Amino acid sequence: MSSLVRRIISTAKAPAAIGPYSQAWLVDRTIYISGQLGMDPASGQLVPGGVVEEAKQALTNIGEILKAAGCDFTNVVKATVLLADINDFSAVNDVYKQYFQSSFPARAAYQVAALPKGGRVEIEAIAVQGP
Amino acid sequence: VRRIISTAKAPAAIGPYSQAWLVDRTIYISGQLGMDPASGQLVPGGVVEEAKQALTNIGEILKAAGCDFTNVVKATVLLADINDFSAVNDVYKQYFQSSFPARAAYQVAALPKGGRVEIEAIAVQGPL
Amino acid sequence: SSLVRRIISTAKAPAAIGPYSQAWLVDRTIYISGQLGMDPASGQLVPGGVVEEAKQALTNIGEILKAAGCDFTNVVKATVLLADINDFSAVNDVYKQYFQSSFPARAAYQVAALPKGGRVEIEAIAVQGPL
Q1: Closest partner CB to B20 (pick from C28, C105, C109)
Q2: Disulfide check for C74: which of A20, B63, C70, C94 has CB 3.0–4.6 Å away?
Q3: CB contact C23 to A (< 8 Å)
Q4: What is the bridge-based pairing of β-strands B72-79 and B20-23?
Q5: Contact A131 C34 (CB under 8 A)
Q6: Is the Cα torsion angle B128, C76, C106, B15 positive or negative in sign?
Q7: What would you report as the CA-atom Rg of chain C, rounded to the nearest whole angstrom?
Q8: What is the maximum alpha-carbon separation in chain A?
Q9: Is B100 on the interface with A (CB under 8 A)?
Q10: In this complex, do A110 and C123 lie within 8 Å of one another by their Cβ atoms?
Q11: In what order do the strands lie in the sheet with A30-36?
Q12: What are chain A's domains?
């Protein structure tokens, strides 16, 4: 008796879902984004190079999903960084660094036991639509 | 639209938390293990059987808030062994038939009571 | 259409050891960053172990809530991250001293490692009162 707008997000500029989930959902004004690994949308595999290159690809994947929802990085209000080794903390912050330039979102970060597909880093996020 | 959601004749005291909270139109649900509503103990059979009970418990909480599985928008799957990824996904699909929600999944070091799987979720009420 | 959005930043909580803000208020919901048992003035962990670190982490969460016009009764969800699952009972006893009644929804588990070698970290979400 008071309907809410719900819309699915799906773009090829981002990797396909290796499991039973959707890329993102928009409900009312909030966007829930699934966890992203450092996978290349063209090859379907993790990029080589290690944790730094995987973190750059994962954040680029998040950017294409945000644009497909009519947003950019200034719309993110919270994020979670999952690491395979707590000793990569300083290096990952240096890549995370450049995408959220200032006015950083809320965040949480810790080392996990293992990630799917043997990845070294995984990142999820929540955003709110303009204005 | 701000109240604690509780199921009738059920246990929920493995510590200081509530089953779920409804605020405005969003429902925040606590992480669920494969525990028996009648026995208070983990069900036998392993990780595959524990996942079936954990999702059934989530279903009973949704019903107490006037919703079903089509109202879930996000979920997180916590595993004790990453080797169980494929098996848990096959059970997960049987509850969400199509139009899957957003999700995240990874392996943790350990779960309470020695459980093998735990699932939390968020839902939004509908005008249905 | 346009919604309210602003940042939270007060010196009664520790400064951010990385690219994140203490909390975000959007519409009526508050997203709070994960807190360790750090002393707000020195940025060092308080002495005593996991029991003392849990008390300080919850005190930090309280000061951020007040800077957003809330208290502990406004929290609807929280996550408890432990370095050792055998600390479950002791941390639960500290938890009850801050969330006394009508408990929020929760999740708890043991992670592989936390930043700065902490023994416990807690995040939460809150919603403002009607008043």
Answers
A1: C105
A2: C70
A3: yes
A4: unpaired
A5: no
A6: negative
A7: 15
A8: 53
A9: yes
A10: no
A11: A6-9, A24-27, A30-36, A121-128, A76-83, A106-111
A12: 6-128 (3.30.1330.40)
